[model samples]
Structure formats: C-alpha cells, structure tokens
Target: KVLAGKKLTDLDPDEWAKAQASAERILVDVGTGDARTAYRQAIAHPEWLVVGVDPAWQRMTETAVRAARKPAKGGAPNLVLVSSAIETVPAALHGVADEVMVLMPWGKLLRGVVLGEADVLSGLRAVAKPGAPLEISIGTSIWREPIPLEIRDLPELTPETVVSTGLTDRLAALGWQVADVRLVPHTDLDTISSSWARRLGSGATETVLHLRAVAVDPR
Candidate 1:
C-alpha cells in the first residue's frame, strides 16, 4: 500500500472548517512526533489554531502544553506548541498556514537531523499565504553515524538540502507550480533501534527511497 494517493481528503474541509472556524487559523504540523497529532487536532479545532513545530525541547511540557489544549469532543479550542527552529518559524508562520504539513526526516544531506531543510523551506516561505497550500512528505535519510561535519568520506550527501532538488527545479525556484506529483509509498521502519542510519540512508547505492513527494506551492 505505497502511500496510496491524494490524501487529507485533498484538503478543503470547508475551507479548513472556515479557517479554523473564523479565527482564521488553519493547521500546521511540522516535524511533530509527540505533539499529539497537533494536540489532538488542535484541541478539537477550537475555531482553528493547531500549531506544532519542534527542534526538541525534550518532550516539551507546559504540562504538555496544557494537555494539548483539551476540549476535543466539543471541538474548537486550539493547541500551539513551539520549540522553534523549522528554521525559525517565530514570525507567526507568515500568512499562518491553512494546511501545511511537512513531515520528513533522514536526509538528502544539506544538514538535517531534525531540522535544516534549507531552513525548512525558509520557514515555508515565512509561513505562506499567497495561494498557500503545502504538504510535502518526501523521504529517505535514515543515515547511521558519520556527520561530524565530514566533507569527503561521506557523512551526509545527496542533494538533501534543497530537499534534493530535481522534482521540477525544486518547485519552480520556490514559485512552486507542479500542482501534482505522485507515488506516495511507505515503510520507514523507525521502530527505534538506532545503531542509527540516516543520510537518506546510503543513497545511489542501498536504494531505499520508497517514494514521497507531496509538494505544493505559494507562501
């Protein structure tokens, strides 16, 4: 079941429930593993404000952001968590996401262990707005050791910075146009047994990029 295709209901759940029910926030889930699914979908969509970014604050706990903003069943509270550094998304994520989810890690080698994807697409063009809609989940980077800043013997390398540019000139030099690309395969066994391996996990050789390219444009 290689990532099937066209997901999140191809978005537009009533214009993201009317942009989080009028608060005009939509949704943002970047690099969250335990942000509890955008804090249980932003405290059950309290008029739309679901933000979660991470560079590890060691399982952050303002009491886990007040239990991820409770109120799920009633639906409409909002949950926000930030340890920052999706390349510094402090400027309130620009236009403030309608739906932006870039969940990928483990390498094309432009300096990335948790965050360094050209500053996470320059903080998704500083929080996108103009025609805003991005959901990239590109793959391959399960590198195992090395990158103590090695230059040649290879610790990390494979066009991993511009997220390994190729897919249509890295989305038209950031003007992003290819409104559709496919092959959403899966199986990234992070079952946590790390003699650890991720640098896109030995690219052009071991060959294990089972596909992931959900790119969108405008920010």
Candidate 2:
C-alpha cells in the first residue's frame, strides 16, 4: 500500500544511507519507541550523534547506553537520553535537532503537537530551522475496556483533546492539501496487538471514535 509514490520500507537501506552520508553532525530521535532502533538505523560514523527523550528514564538501561556509544556489530551507536515529557520539546529543541520523529506516538505526545498551543502551531513551530523535518505518526483508533468504570456516572474513555481522521485527517489538521499514512505492506497485527495488550495491562478493545468536524475555510 505505498502512497506518495514510495514505500517506507523501500527507502530503508539506501535513502537511510544517503541521509547518513549527507549528515555531518547530530540527529535527534523525538520520543523514540526504543533507542535501540535509532542506534541500529544510524550509520557507522563518529560524527553521527543521536539524542532521545522519554519520561520513563528507568526504561533506559546502562547496557543500552553503552550499546549506543560503541559501534557494535549491528549498526550505529552513540545516543544521549534525557528524561523529559514531550510537552517540554518546544523549549528544549529550540535550536537543537536536524531531524525529529514522533514515531507511533502511542498516546505519549502532547495535545499541542496536533493543533497548537495558545492558538498557534506550537509543536511544529517549536522544532527548529525551517527545512528540518518534524515527522509525526497519528493514530485514528482509540479503545476502552469492555468493563464500565467503577463510577457508573463516569463516561467511557475517548481521545477528546486528540482529534484524528485517518491519515487524511491528520494531514488536513496539519493544513496539508494531501497527506499519506497508508500501510506500505502487510503488517503483523496480532503480534502488535499482544504486545500493546501487555503494555495496557488489558485486552485490546475497539474504542476508536472520531470527533466529528468540518473545515470552515476553503481557498
């Protein structure tokens, strides 16, 4: 299901090498899923630097840090981790990164990343010089457990602050005429489901609901 004329996997080895080759200094991994992925994706070069952020500092281990610093048999290493929530990104990244990615945000991102803060596109505007990429992955699905809350009066969990509309929705909200978040190829849903279920401490439920809206401006 490639869109925009290319599959994400297709750019894996070559384009990655190109990005690495052209890169002379550091790269930032905004809210990385696992620092190891950043380390593995980087090329072998002392000039390459990786910066990662996560609120859960304990999740990062000494072993992982060392693994990132030393060029292993696998791939690139050398990462610096900071324990901070994504909300602090704007001020933190003021003049920092050449690249930033909010991969599979998984409810970890702040509301500002989508719409903006103080009525401005705070998240996007926070990144850096113009041309630097602020990559984002938006989820269109949300789920709540089948069981009702202990308080009968409590409403079900829904992503209220978080508004989404398929891949199209994310782009529209971003003010792009067209955008793509299509599945490039087959996915291992079952494997992904079980992993997330364990993380949520509950079974996966289809709670993905949309916040209905319409575009006011057309130009």
Candidate 3:
C-alpha cells in the first residue's frame, strides 16, 4: 500500500536508484517501527538522506503518508521507506551507508544481534560503507517479556545462557570495532525522537543501552 502522494515499494527500481544517487552518507534504521526516527533525521539533516526499512509495512502506513508530503509541508524529501526483511537488505543497498541505526529492536532482531547471531550482523555489515559507524540501542528491560516465536526455542536467549563479555565486547568479537557504550537517560527517551522510544519511556525508565561500533570487512 503506497502512502501519501509519493511511491514506496520494494519493486520500484527507479526510486531505489534515486535513493542511492550521490548519497554523501546513508543511514539505515532497521526495525524502524513507525519510522519516526528516520523522519526526524531527514528533517534535521537535509544534506543526509535516511532510509527506513521494516518488513512489517502495515505498522508504517500512516507514517508513509506523512513521508509523502513535502519536507516543507511536514515530511522531508530526504526520507524514503523500504519495505523488506531486515536480514535480507536488497542487493542495491550493499556498501552504501555511512551510518546504520537499529533502535529499540524486539523479537527476532533483538535476539539476533545481541546474542551474537551471525546472519543479522552480516546483513547489517552488507549495507554499511567500509569503516562506517553502526549505532544500536537496545531496550534491556524488554527481554523479561516472553520471547518472540522465531527465536523463542533457541538456547542462546534461554535462562541458562551465560554472557561473559558485555554486548560491546560481543560486537567487538563480531569484528565490529566498539566505539562507545553507555546508558541512554530517561529524559532523552522521553523527549526522544522515535515514537517507540517515547512510548517505551512512558512505561518505565527502560534500561536502554546505546552502543556504537564501526562496520568492518568480514574477510
């Protein structure tokens, strides 16, 4: 379902090309949810283009219409939404991004990256430019909830699974050069850019860990 006046599709080759053309630096926000995060970035940095990817397109229909408007109208030209699975980012986007953001991811995604699952990290690296930055903010408190169906049976996320190295160290283990790791304050999450973050903040002070790592060549 295309929203607003603008076209958004996995099948649109032309728009996909337009999204990559002369991009100074690209940012990909995976599991973007409502895409509020991408929308804010596009408005703030017109020079930088932001693409939001989420396979669950239904959740973003309204946000897509908002994106359809001109930046002056409300949404910026710098934003584009791609509906696709996070692990199978399109071939066209490989090595095109300078920064990648994964904010408050849950379900399969949360289990994949945090537990050192190979495919998710590899797919993330596939879209990032060499030596670029990848920032992931995880809501630690959410883990106590029942696990998502996709990974619920996996022993990695089970109570018996023990973690020796912190998540940053695990990122380093995956060949990502860990840059920064710290707690994101409640105020930031409260007034925070993303709608999901804001709602999460309201529930309780979420134990949010903001981590930044450099994308690396897997060779």
Candidate 4:
C-alpha cells in the first residue's frame, strides 16, 4: 500500500480507514535503517502488518525492491516502508502501532529516548495503541568513539541503555510497565533477526543492551 521510502501523502478518510483495516496487528520499526528487520518480520508473520520508518530515503532502496518482489520471489504484501523521523510520525499512523521497535539507534534518536526527553516519548505515545509493547536495542559502537560531544558523556548509559545498570524504577517514571531489561550477548545474535545485531555481533564482543516495556494507558 506504501510506496518505496516515500512519505505518505495527505491521507484521505477512506484511504486511511482502509489502511488501518488491512491489519489486526500493526508493528512499526522506528529508525529502520536498511529495513531488513521489517522485511523479515513481515515475511515470517503474514498475519501482522509491518511498517518501517527512517529519515534517510536512500538507505531504503534495497527494502523497497525486496518488499515489491512477488510472493514466489520471497516478497510480502504486509510490509511498508516510510521515510520520516520518529518525532514527526504521519497523522495517519496515530494510535495505529500495536508494537514499536527501536533497534540500534544512533545520534539524536538514541540520546533523546535514553535521556527521557518528553518529546521523544510523547511522540511514541501518540502513535502507540494502548498497552502496546515498546522494544529497544542499542549497541556499543555509539559508546566507543566519534559521537557528538553532547551525547558522549554517557549520561543515560545505565538503566536506560544497560540492563545490568538495573531497571523497573525509572521506566515507571516514563509511564511504561517495565517488562524486561537485559544484556544480550553477542553469541545470542546467531539466532537474532535484526541485521544491526548481526553486523555488530560479527566483530565486537561488546554485548547489546535490550529493553521491553508496555505503554500504560494515557495518563
């Protein structure tokens, strides 16, 4: 239903209603760089629709080609790719996502969510259905070197990024029900689905930080 890496145009009422009606479960992958994760998820679970969003339109070329392939050629009708930043999600997507995934985010997207900025969480809340699951994974590359000086301080490393830093307390403050937080060993990436995880796990011994929380009803 979505064009390749195209920002969906102003959706009319009938079109918007049809789009929402196509799926019982909507899974949105925020900052989906190459969109390999979205492709895999949609292919595996035909019952659930998967939407991938990223600010960079160029990176989604492969995803667009993959998503448009015929069923015999391993394509899926349940996948869509959109070009947009998380903070400015399309109005058509409001309260549409049953599950939101943020995987290996860098730059502003990483720091904003980890630091508990009101806008970042508020944007996510606006798009998420009540009690939707929010899952995030961050890698060690961002911590090593070559990041902006502002985020280089390692401010939200613990609890927000690292499970070993502890959990439950701060997540509650974000209006989320802390479901699970933990460090995912590189070895575990063998079975993991994310392309970002595979790339990071291939060479680094540094573990990935993972967190899952359920959005609480609007407060």
Candidate 5:
C-alpha cells in the first residue's frame, strides 16, 4: 500500500509505469520522516520521480494529503510515499532508484548505518540501481546529553571513526563505495529541503556528518 494523501491505496501498476516513463530520474529517500524532503524535491524537479519510504506512515499523512491536491494548490504528482522500513523495501522498487538519500535518520535506521549493519546496507543496495549515487546525513546532536539507550553503547560517529572502525570497508563489502565523509555546518543545513534540516540548523554548534557514496552490484 502507498500513502496517497489522506488514505492508503493500492499502487496502480499502469499509473506507476506511466510516471516512471515520464520521469528523467528516480530518487528514493529512505527514512523520510514527514516526507517533506521528498515532497519538496518533487515540487522543485517535476522531471524526477521522488519516493519517500518510512515505516511510520502516520508521520507522512499531512504532506501526503497536501500532495494529493491539484497542482495549483501545491500538489506533487511526482511524489510517492511508501510505508516500509529500509530493511525490507518492496520488490516493486528493487534496483529502481537512480539516487538514494537518508537524511536526519533516527531509531534503528540511525543505528543500522552507524554500526554498518548488513541488513540495512544490503536493503539500500537492493533499491538502488548499480552505480547509483547515495547520500546520508546525520546530526552530531544525537550524541549529546540524554542519549537514547539503543545507541548509548555505540561510539560517537566521526569521519575518522568511520574509517578507523572499518565502517567504510564494511560498506564497500555491502556494495557501497563510500567516496567522501565530511562535516557540514549546521547553518548549511538550511539548504536541505526537509523540515528536520531547518530545525537541526537552528542549533549553534551542531554539525551534520555527511557521507557520499555510490552503490555497486553485489558480488
């Protein structure tokens, strides 16, 4: 089932095919909380098919509802919302995305990437076309005081931490060639299209850990 505005509906294969045919590229945003980024991307680039996938469908209701309206009323026909975890994306989306993004991830999604879990990385690889570009952004504030119990034992993530801990190599073994890891100033987060980005940007010292990579065919 796909979130189409206020309701869950079956994804019509014919309509999906037509949309795919018209789109110049397929971009999938995993762990897309609130789906604002995906919605904004679809509105900004009409030629791209933007899909937002998250296990929490209720968080996407507002944006999905708004996107179901007429184009004059801020509807985004290019935006599709799927309710699913990154560990098990629907087969319909297998090897479909030209690009994949995970921005401001939390909960298991956050832990998965930070720990270089095979299920998470393999799932990401499953949805992406061979050589597809991948981007992941995580905020440093997640490690501040009052940390969640789930990630409390995990070491703080830094560019050096990723390499020193063999996370980069693990990702490569899972079919992702991590090309770069850098810290992005919080103020720069404003350029991102998600509401979470704006909130994260308001912090005085917060920085985003940004990773850029490309998916490779599983050996």
Candidate 6:
C-alpha cells in the first residue's frame, strides 16, 4: 500500500506491473526522509518511476498529500510513497528497482549499512534487479561531534574500515558488490533533490562517505 492525500491506498498488482513495464527505470529510495527526493525525481523524469520507502508515515504526509494533487498543482503520478522500513520492504517491491539509494541514513539504518548486517543487506538486494546500481551516502557528522547513541559504537565508514572490517567482501557475499568508496563534499550532495541533502549542503561542512555498488548473484 502507498500513501496519497492523507489516505492509504492499495496498489493493484496489474497496475503496478503495467507501470513498471512502461517505465524506463525504477528507482527505490530507501530510508527516504520526507520523500522530497522521490517527488522531485518523479517530477523531473516522467519516464522513471520513483518509490520512496520510509518507516515514518507522518514525516511523509505533507509530500504525499502534495503529490496527490493534479499535475498542474504539483502532482507526480510516477512517485509512490510507501510506509515501510528497509528491513521489511513489501513483497510487491521485490525485484522492482533498477537503482537503489540510501542517502544520509541515521539510526538503525546507519548501523546496519556500516556493519553490513545480514537483514539490511538482504533487504536491499531484495528490491533491486540483477546487477542494478546501488548508492549509499553517509555523512561524517556521526563520527564527529554530537554522535547519536544508536550508532556511537559503530566505526567510521572509510575505505580502510570497509576493507579491514571485511564489509566489502561481506556485502559481495550477499549479492552486493561494493565497487567504490569516496569522500564527497557536502556541496556535491546539493545536486541531489532530497531535502536532507540540501540541508547538509547548506548548514554543515560535512563530508559524506559515498559507497557505490551493484547487485549481483549472491554466494
């Protein structure tokens, strides 16, 4: 089910299938806070279907409501806001995404990715098509001042840490081949359509650990 105009609506299987078939690509934004990115993407690319999945429905209500309006009023028919956590993505979304993204993740999602948790990795793989691209961008603020207790124990997500902790190999074993880890300035993140990215770009001088990967056959 998806949220539209303050209401939860069931997704018809046939309609979903037809939409997917017509779409040039499907992008799933996991941990999509506010779903602004998803909405922007849908508005920008009519050929693409953008799905924003987040656990907190309240945070997404405003955008969901705005997306329910008519096209002239800022509606995006290609955008779907789903209330779900990454670990338990709906079966309807399985094997639907051509690209998967997790940007500036916090809390459990942050720990799950940094630690390469089995469920998190599997859940990510679950929604993506074979060999689909994956992008996970994490801000460095968590390792600096005012770190959240939830991820206080987790190590920084650096290339060295990824290799030393065997996160690269571990993810590869679970069907995600992590190909690169790079430091991206907050300015670079501004190009992203997400509200969080914009805030990070303007409010802080934080650097992001950008991980690039691809979904492959799991061992």
Clash number for every model? 22, 4, 1, 0, 0, 0
Candidate 6 per-residue C-alpha lDDT over 1-219 given as tens digits, one digit per residue, 9 for 90 to 100 = 689778777878898899899999999998877778778788989899998888887788878888989999999999888888889878999999999998877777878899999999999999999989999988776788677887787767787888899899989999999889888775454444367335544644557888999999999
Stretches > 4 Å off in candidate 4: 5-16, 146-150, 160-174, 187-206
Minimal lDDT window, size 10, model 4: 187-196
Q: How does each model score on TM-score?
A: 0.31, 0.48, 0.78, 0.79, 0.93, 0.92
TM-score of 4: 0.79
Residue 121 displacement (Å), model 6: 0.4
lDDT score of residue 82 within candidate 2: 50
Residues 98-205 of candidate 3: C-alpha lDDT, one tens digit per residue: 888888786667777767676787777778888889888866555455756654554433212323435445566655777766666563553223674355345445
Error of 4 at 136 (Å): 0.9
lDDT of 1: 0.46
Residue-wise C-alpha lDDT for candidate 4, range 19-110, written one tens digit per residue = 66888789988877677778888888887888787777567677677677788987877887776777777787788889988887766677
What ordering of candidates by TM-score runs from best to worst? 5, 6, 4, 3, 2, 1
Which stretches in model 1 have alpha-carbon errors above 4 Å? 1-19, 40-48, 51-76, 79-96, 99-142, 146-168, 173-219
Model 5, 71-130: lDDT tens per residue?
999999899999889898788889889999988888888899999899998998999999
RMSD to native for every prediction?
A: 14.5, 11.7, 4.3, 4.0, 2.3, 2.2
Cα RMSD, model 5: 2.3
Q: Which of candidates 2 and 3 is the stronger one according to TM-score?
A: 3
Q: After superposition, how far is residue 4 of candidate 6 from its true place, in Å?
A: 1.1
Candidate that beats the other on lDDT, 3 or 5, i.e. the better one: 5
lDDT of 2 by residue, 1-219 (tens): 001111111223454345445557556655555444444435444466565666654544432444534354442444455555655653544445565655444432534333333222333334434345555543334223442223223333235433342333453454322322332223322212222114433544432222222222212
Tens digits of lDDT, candidate 1, 1-219: 000011111233465345445675666766665454555465555666776666653443432534523344333235555555665666545667766665543232223322334555656556655555665543434354433332324333233433554534545455444354443344333321111123223322222322222235534
- Which is superior by TM-score, 3 or 4? 4
State each model's CA lDDT, in order.
0.46, 0.41, 0.68, 0.69, 0.86, 0.84
**Which pairs of residues collide in candidate 4?**
none
Tell me the spans in candidate 2 whose CA falls farther than 4 Å from its real position.
Answer: 1-25, 43-47, 72-77, 90-92, 108-121, 138-219
Comparing 2 with 4 on TM-score, the higher-scoring candidate is: 4
